[model samples]
Target: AYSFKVVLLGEGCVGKTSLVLRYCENKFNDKHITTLQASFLTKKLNIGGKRVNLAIWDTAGRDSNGAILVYDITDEDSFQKVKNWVKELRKMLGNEICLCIVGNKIDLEKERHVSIQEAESYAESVGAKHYHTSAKQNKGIEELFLDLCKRMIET
Candidate 1:
């Protein structure tokens, strides 16, 4: 089985952790919990008749002073922070790391400050697979992860 690292990058409260919980654990919650530093999880799934292991990295969405630069899209300032994080990962992890930028909170589309097209464009600019998902409604959560996995293997 091939081992791979899947990293999640987005603004705080954008639902990175919640999306993981919903798809990876089959659970969903509306509660807002800004992740600190990072959360790691492992899952084994069948890939081409063999089980492949996925190492997921959930980073701190909020910085000191509770400023969620890369965690919350509503925060506005996180837009640049998220970009910086992506750049850092590319440099530190090399070009082999599989990256996924999840634009969480699709349920709040009406209040969305970042458009899906905009997020998609930015993600593509960084050579990442981008997706917009809503963990609370279980919308596109599984497909997003599956898509990322597919990209990692197929690309």
Candidate 2:
């Protein structure tokens, strides 16, 4: 069996925890409390015809093969943090770590402060794939996780 480590990073209230929880449980929370400390979870599944164990760490301690940087589309401030996180990840993990910039809260598109084109461009600038997700409605959750898994494997 192949095993991989995935790390998640973002500022507070950007839906980092919510996205992971929704991916694992197929459930959403209206009031997700702040993650004061680090958290981790594991999922075992088949990817590319191979059984893989994906270990997702909410903290930064573990050496990660890939990372997901999340941002709130409705909050521009959260978007700015994506760049900072990306820089830090590259500095610590080098350019080899598969990174994905995720724009969350797409359920509130009308209230979105950051445009998709802009986010996509920023993601490209950092040499990372970009995805839109709505944890509140469980949209694009599976695709994001699977894509990250594929990227990790390829790298």
Candidate 3:
């Protein structure tokens, strides 16, 4: 098995922890619970006879090979911080880090302040991919994490 570390980077109440809960526990709630620093979830997989063990940690720590930058589509401020985190990650890890930014809480797209085009465009401009997830609705979480693990494995 191959072990890899990933981090959830985002502002408070941006649904970063909820997305991981959806992936790791298959659950979600509307109430915001202040997440624990360096808290983690374990995700294991075997693809094409290859083992992947993903340890997803919080922004309280780093030393990560995979960076899951998260933002709220309804909060433009959170989205802007995504770019800020990107610049810092580039300086610290260069392009060697497997990076992906997510627009979470997509079930509330009617209130979305960040457009799909803008999100995807910015992600690409910074050499990362954009993903949309709704932990509330369980949409896109599988694609997001599975793809990330595969990329980090290759990395």
Candidate 4:
């Protein structure tokens, strides 16, 4: 069996839980806060017909295989928070760690405060993948997870 440990981190209320729920259950709760503290979730899937189990955490760990730094596209400050997160992760896990910068809440395109071009540029500068997702609309959610997992496995 193949297993991986993935951590999700971001500024509070940036749809961290929402993204988890969408990825694990394919369900979206517009008003749900499963836990204020870090929680654990296990997702089993077949990638290229191979069984893979993922252990997801809401908090970071020193031995994490990959990290997802989430932010709200409508909040520019959240993007800055992601930048800080990337630096922090690199410090803890070193440069080879698998990392992705996720800009959430794309459903509110009219309210977007961070331009994708700028965010993508920042992500590239830091050598992390960038993805735009909307938990509510289920956009790019699977792709984000898959990319992270593939990167982790490749590493």
The order of the candidates by lDDT, greatest first, is 3, 2, 4, 1
Q: Model 4: residues >4 Å from true position, as ranges?
A: 32-34
Off by over 4 Å in 2: 60-62
How accurate locally is residue 41 in candidate 3, as Cα lDDT from 0 to 100?
72
Which one wins on TM-score?
3
Answer with 3 or 4, whichever has the higher TM-score. 3
Candidate 4 Cα RMSD (Å): 2.1
Candidate 3 clashes between residue pairs 3 or more apart in a chain or in different chains:
none
Steric collisions counted per model: 6, 0, 0, 0
Q: Give one digit per residue, the lDDT tens place, for model 3 in 1-155.
A: 88889889998968887888888888888898787676877888887689888898865414788899999999998999889889999999899888899999899999999888999999999999899999999999999989988888775
Clash list (residue pairs), candidate 1: 11-70, 11-71, 11-72, 12-71, 12-72, 69-78
lDDT per prediction? 0.64, 0.87, 0.87, 0.85
lDDT of 1 by residue, 49-117 (tens): 766677777777512111111234454455556778777777765555556666666677676676567
How close is each model in CA RMSD to the real structure?
Answer: 5.5, 1.8, 1.5, 2.1
